[model samples]
Target: GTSKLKYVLQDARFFLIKSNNHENVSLAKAKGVWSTLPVNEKKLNLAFRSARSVILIFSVRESGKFQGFARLSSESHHGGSPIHWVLPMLGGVFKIDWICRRELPFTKSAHLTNPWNEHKPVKIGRDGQEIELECGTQLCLLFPPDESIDLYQVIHKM
Candidate 1:
């Protein structure tokens, strides 16, 4: 077995999206829909087509704190339930054709303590990223819970 972390893929784009507390939109619904955004669709298409992993963090707009994170990856599934990349509409509507099957649903960063109970806030910076939107995309040098834990720990931990 390799010691290197495989879950955190190379060239992955760590992005952020905010939602109001009252909103009832599920991540399942958010997966395959073309919602309007202010980002540069040109580079987004590139991420959708090629990026190995796209880390989408969900935050609370009202509280101004990050919530959970979802992992999305590019796929070319030609099966019965095939994924497609639809063209952008007039109002800057765009879609990322990928499968989002795993998520870590902690409410805040400090809650996600390490094995020794040290808090590591997954901070976002100002200048090192691009692709702006009401839901902006950033390429921050952040770390996802990879080698220290498995994908199931966050969901299955009691």
Candidate 2:
């Protein structure tokens, strides 16, 4: 007798990469997009808080069409070519370009914080409640599946 393996949505956060320039998104498609936030220890720690993998949901500007998520090679880190420093942030890349065919319906959606909405892009969902996309993709599952999840799913499958 076991209880449902539930996860708290507010416990995790995602990076919503938005860009107005198609060139910027194109560059992101090739090399992962960079965050506009200035580099600092506090922000760095917050980016990788709880040591959970950060999910990056890229979206087109104005239209709010999501491109895809990035599978980062490493945690948010600084230092690279001088060109990277041009933006006051580090530039990185992901392995895949699997696009997400969906549009962000709610500007106030709990999934991500809109920087244009007078908030930082790294901000998390408000209210501390479990939130899910219409597709039912939980924030917890969106991150790299954890160690026990294999058995967790197996048990739930029965």
Candidate 3:
């Protein structure tokens, strides 16, 4: 018995784009939304570290086909943090904008963090020794630095 495969993958380290495709990325979270691509679900685990970095314990596939996962990364600096707005955890034409870099909009007349991070946005379950993300079936997002955020905005599909 034999199988046709270019190369095998591994998760000895954090999640990484396995191929050269620029759309593949490690699953991540923000406020409450999770960064998801339109891919067939293989066994997946997302470990969110700090305010950035999505560690894929295993990995995800592409939307239509398997071209190998290689686009997004765990680097916090994938893009610079320039102030911008994005759709909130709940997708919509209009939603709670995620203004990056910029200070919280002047409420009354003072700058504070927009929305607010009062609660730990991410909840979790566990598998063996690795951390697993709790899902929203309730609460997520992947707000990359700046340019990368733009990339994220474009590639992040359902």
Candidate 4:
């Protein structure tokens, strides 16, 4: 997609709160990440809104070359498990709107799944073609797992 990408952010801006003596905290496009998002946005809000975790690849072009290879995702290990430790140092506070908290206006994603009964053992369908799970809104099989992950490069890409 970078072949089609004409431009990228120099100083990125998304959620900026009011009232601040802050330095206008923003990602330099390097080491950037977005948090638990409505389970959703964009390709979501259309149709039934599949994919709770579609990979978002972005770039931060500082000069003529690039500062790229950043991906934001919602698969596995729910919420912001990996980022909580360092995110506080960035000097921003997280506020949840409890009024609309527990709803999934957009739910599901390709290759992203919370372990079913994690208390039990887990298994992987190695080298299989396209395994389609029959369920409701839970599974958002975007272009099939094999296609999405590209098994040819796998040690089996989940």
User: What are the RMSDs of all candidates, in order?
Assistant: 10.7, 9.4, 18.8, 18.2
The global Cα lDDT (0 to 1) of model 3 is: 0.22
Estimate every model's Cα lDDT from 0 to 1: 0.36, 0.38, 0.22, 0.22
Best by lDDT: 2
lDDT of 1 by residue, 54-146 (tens): 555554445544444444432222223332334223223333322232233334333232221122333332211322222222112122333
Stretches > 4 Å off in candidate 3: 1-8, 11-34, 37-63, 71-158
Cα lDDT over the full model 1 = 0.36
Worst 10 residues of 2 by lDDT: 127-136
Cα error, candidate 1, residue 118 (Å): 26
| Predicted candidate 4 versus true structure: per-residue lDDT over 1-158, tens digit per residue | 22111122111111111111111212312223333233332222221124221222111222111111121222222334344332221322122111000111122232333243232211121111111222111222221222222212211121
Better of 1 and 4 by lDDT: 1
TM-scores, in order shown? 0.40, 0.43, 0.17, 0.21
Where model 4 places Cα greater than 4 Å from the true spot, the runs are 1-36, 39-55, 61-66, 69-82, 85-155
Tens digits of per-residue lDDT for model 3, 18-135: 2222222221223211232223112222332232323332122232211111222332222333323332221111111121221111121122121222322221112112222322
Decide which is better by TM-score, 1 or 3.
1
From the highest lDDT down, the ranking of the candidates is 2, 1, 3, 4
Please report the TM-score between candidate 1 and the true structure: 0.40
How high is the lDDT of residue 46 in model 4?
A: 28
